[PDB]
Amino acid sequence: NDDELHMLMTDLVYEALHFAKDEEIKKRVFQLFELADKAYKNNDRQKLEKVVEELKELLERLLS
């Protein structure tokens, strides 16, 4: 589901920014958010999924 995926995406963005101690991380996360936002608006499932997967990895790295 595309709305469930979008909700996951914004959740990952919030947490990724929360733990984004440096500027490079914030910039990467914001770029990923923008890409996901556009993919969602244009109903592009594949672009949205790819961005979400990258955000998930990014956050796991910040947490670990």
Binding site: N1, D3, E4
Partner: protein, 49 residues
């Protein structure tokens, strides 16, 4: 929000009841239970206060 979403993504209605007891009269409380009135017998009674 969609009717087909999994539970974690379903909408939930939340009501938060914040309870404060500031320096003021406090008339915000539940009902005071009453019993049947008994007459012509020795009873332990409570009428209002």
């Amino acid at each position: 929000f969609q009717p087909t979403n999994g539970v974690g993504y379903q909408p939930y209605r939340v009501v938060v009841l914040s309870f404060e007891l500031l320096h003021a009269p406090a008339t915000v409380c539940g009902p005071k239970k009453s019993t049947n009135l008994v007459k012509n017998k020795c009873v332990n009674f409570n009428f209002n206060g």
